[PDB]
Design a protein around this ligand. Structure first.
Ligand SMILES: OC[C@@H]1[C@H](O)[C@H](O)[C@@H](O)c2[nH]cc[n+]21
Length: 347
């Protein structure tokens, strides 16, 4: 059984340490990548951890897939923050590509970068390539003529959350601020579409606005084509899937480590217009996403099924943080919802 919120252990008997994670399937096995968290403090001592399974119940430790660097001044030197890793397989190159949220050593959460690394094998080791803010010099495809010409005197908009500040954010003030050096990227995920095009989905503009950016054909860089959605909405922790033509994304709000009400977002084209729907969680404690925060949606295409993965964060001992895994169910109109079960089994 899958017992959400309990202590899960690997085949050696050690607590599973793979937070903010996601999963892929390759050559007959599932690989689970996530943050290696410490028992005290919050910044990783090690990097990105990996576990493998044939059955989704029994997990073998494969070791650290992307390690912090021992080189002075390196972008991923020990002391850097590495969060919310995701791995995708590129069918054209035959490589495994990892993207993650990086903050440079000693700089807090200021830098707001995405990083990319590559492996010939699913478990690693992965080789770091580069990091940065996203699409320097490019405007979003859906920013209007009028919005692009506006100018915003920064001395006039110092106080956050005034009516004039909120309107300015909605119309793209922080896009223009960050245009030259690139858009900010904190919480993030990846999605490979049915045409083989991959997308990098991230919280941008001081976490206020979601952006969706097309990747190059090798998945190692951005093309310049991107959209911005829900400006000022403070959507975080994105998880995404596609079913029968329709895109579905689950997010949290922005309340630190505290659980909050999940949001459901939908579109009929990845770079088209998106809409916000009610909280997909139902039943007791649905108002706090069952004490969790979204991380990934795993498809099982052989069954036409989908499963919701979340973290149950314990900020006072982050390594003791737990996992919530629950089936996605669908209503009469095809819209996904999620119920809590103490114990359930895969078909
Ligand atoms: O900063 C600490 C944590 C991590 O960055 C999580 O990945 C992110 O979802 C979040 N939101 C608010 C606080 N935090």
């Amino acid at each position: 059984g899958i017992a959400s919120g309990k202590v899960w252990r690997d085949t050696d008997g050690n607590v599973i340490n793979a937070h903010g994670g996601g999963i892929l399937f390759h050559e007959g096995k599932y690989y689970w990548f996530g943050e290696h968290r410490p028992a005290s403090g919050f910044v990783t001592e090690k990097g990105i951890n990996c576990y493998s399974s044939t059955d989704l119940y029994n997990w073998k430790s494969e070791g650290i897939a992307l390690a912090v660097s021992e080189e002075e001044g390196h972008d991923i030197e020990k002391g850097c923050i590495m969060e919310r890793p995701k791995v995708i397989y590129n069918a054209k190159t035959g490589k495994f590509v990892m993207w993650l949220h990086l903050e440079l050593k000693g700089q807090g959460y200021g830098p707001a970068r995405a990083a990319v690394a590559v492996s010939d094998s699913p478990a690693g080791p992965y080789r770091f390539i580069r990091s940065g803010r996203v699409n320097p010099g490019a405007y979003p495809l859906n920013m209007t003529r009028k919005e692009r010409k506006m100018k915003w005197n920064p001395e006039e908009y110092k106080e956050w959350w005034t009516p004039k500040w909120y309107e300015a954010i909605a119309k793209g003030m922080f896009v223009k601020r960050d245009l030259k050096d690139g858009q900010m990227s904190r919480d993030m995920t990846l999605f490979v579409d049915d045409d083989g095009k991959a997308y990098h989905i991230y919280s941008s503009e001081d976490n206020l606005t979601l952006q969706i950016a097309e990747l190059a054909d090798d998945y190692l860089s951005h093309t310049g084509k991107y959209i911005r959605i829900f400006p000022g909405g403070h959507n975080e922790a994105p998880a995404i899937f596609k079913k029968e033509g329709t895109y579905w994304m689950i997010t949290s709000g922005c309340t630190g480590w505290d659980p909050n009400k999940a949001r459901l977002l939908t579109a009929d084209s990845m770079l088209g217009e998106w809409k916000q729907l009610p909280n997909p969680c139902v039943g007791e404690d649905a108002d706090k996403t069952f004490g969790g925060q979204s991380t990934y949606i795993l498809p099982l295409p052989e069954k036409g099924q989908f499963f919701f993965m979340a973290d149950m964060w314990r900020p006072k001992s982050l390594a003791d943080s737990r996992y919530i895994w629950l089936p996605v169910q669908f209503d009469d109109k095809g819209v996904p919802f999620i119920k809590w079960m103490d114990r359930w089994n895969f078909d």
